[PDB]
Amino acid sequence: DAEFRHDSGYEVHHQKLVFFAEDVGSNKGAIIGLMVGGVV
Numbered sequence: 876d877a878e879f880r881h882d883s884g885y886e887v888h889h890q891k892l893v894f895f896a897e898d899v900g901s902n903k904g905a906i907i908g909l910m911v912g913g914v915v
Contacts, residue, residue, distance in 0.1 A: 876895070
């Protein structure tokens with residue numbers, strides 16, 4: 876994700892992708908909520 880306004884930062888070799896996947900996994904919950912609607 877944007878660690879700060881989509882700033883640059885390769886971080887590491889591929890562990891960066893691993894972390895991204897985790898972010899994604901968790902996010903899904905909030906994502907569904909948004910799809911439904913905040914006031915829904």
